[PDB]
Design goal:
The protein is of the alpha+beta class and 331 residues long. It contains eleven helices and nine strands. The structure holds ligand WAP.
């Protein structure tokens, strides 16, 4: 009879202090550009809700990326657009450049700045220890910004990070799952990719916040420093929690569940079992050691907690000793 409520420990009331129209995205009327300014060059991808193309803007010969949407509810498009507009100009956030509709096909299309992304297949296997720190820092810039701006991404994962390694340039993309944080709001748990889902999603706690992003970020980091993609390799949503439980241990899981008075889907009773909390050494090997340091491990531990309220904030993370060499070097 009742899960215990949660609020975010930071940036809690940011949207409340803004005018309505900032977060009330169903109000948003869309500014349409001229679709004849863009010619499609080649397909790049086929996401869940979109097909993605490289294009040229013929007015200025600018290279651009075009996301043509499949049928989605207008208020979700208004949501994606509103968040992009609110965040435009923020550090390492992708820039929305324009919005167009095919006059006949009535299909909306988002137009983005092009990033010359070297492929995350082969990039991630040439990344030095310093490289990872630098790019982890650059993602945290984006996350602290969007959080301070009342937004949670909700789909942080390698595919949604664009890196031009030649120009040491990073952009957090795909804001189509992002939502505004409002104290006491119960969100949809059917979000994020399986391997990147935090416990709150898996146990069905809806009153989550920005700290979801910090779990996902931990997942990314783990896979990068231990060179194990994906780090938590679940067979389905249920088993994903088990993979977490096999590392973080069942004791803290049940403490988390008590505190928030969560009702576990009675299925979980079977397969969760009892499991100790493992040390990170069980994942350190000769081919990864050159990426793992005590400071990296300390950092990771403080991202990957069941209790969303005890995970580092983006700002806290940025102050971690893991990034001292990076922070000092960025002068
Ligand atoms: N935004 C952006 C951007 C910017 N650059 N870029 C590149 N650059 C190509 C490698 C040169 C690829 C690329 N690919 C891609 C593939 C599937 C889905 C999405 N997506 C989903 N939601 N928004 C976007 C994007 N996206 C981008």
């Amino acid at each position: 009879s009742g899960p215990v409520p949660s609020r975010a420990r930071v940036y809690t009331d940011v949207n409340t202090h803004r005018p309505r129209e900032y977060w009330d995205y169903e109000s948003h009327v869309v500014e349409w550009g001229n679709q004849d300014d863009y010619q499609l060059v080649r397909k790049l991808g086929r996401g869940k809700y979109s097909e993605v193309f490289e294009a040229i803007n013929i007015t200025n010969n600018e290279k651009v990326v075009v996301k043509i949407l499949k049928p989605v509810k207008k208020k979700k498009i208004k949501r994606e657009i509103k968040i992009l507009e609110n965040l435009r100009g923020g550090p390492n956030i992708i820039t929305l450049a324009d919005i167009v509709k095919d006059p006949v096909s009535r299909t909306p299309a988002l137009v983005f700045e092009h990033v010359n992304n070297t492929d995350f297949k082969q990039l991630y296997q040439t990344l030095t220890d310093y490289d990872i720190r630098f790019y982890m820092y650059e993602i945290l810039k984006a996350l602290d910004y969007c959080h301070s701006m009342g937004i949670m991404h909700r789909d942080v994962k390698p595919h949604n990070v664009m890196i031009d390694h030649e120009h040491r340039k990073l952009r957090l993309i795909d804001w189509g799952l992002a939502e505004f944080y409002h104290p006491g709001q119960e969100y949809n748990v059917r979000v994020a990719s399986r391997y990147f889902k935090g416990p709150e999603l898996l146990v069905d706690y809806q009153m989550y916040d920005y700290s979801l992003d910090m779990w996902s970020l931990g997942c990314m980091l783990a896979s990068m420093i231990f060179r194990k993609e994906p780090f938590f390799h679940g067979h389905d949503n249920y088993d994903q929690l088990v993979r977490i439980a096999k590392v973080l241990g069942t004791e803290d899981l049940y403490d988390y569940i008590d505190k928030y008075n969560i009702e576990l889907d009675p299925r979980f009773n079977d397969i969760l079992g009892r499991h100790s909390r493992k040390r990170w050494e069980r994942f350190v090997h000769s081919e990864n050691q050159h990426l793992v340091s005590p400071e990296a491990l300390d950092f990771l531990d403080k991202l990957l907690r069941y209790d969303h309220q005890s995970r580092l904030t983006a700002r806290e993370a940025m102050e971690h000793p893991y990034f001292y060499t990076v922070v000092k070097d960025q002068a």
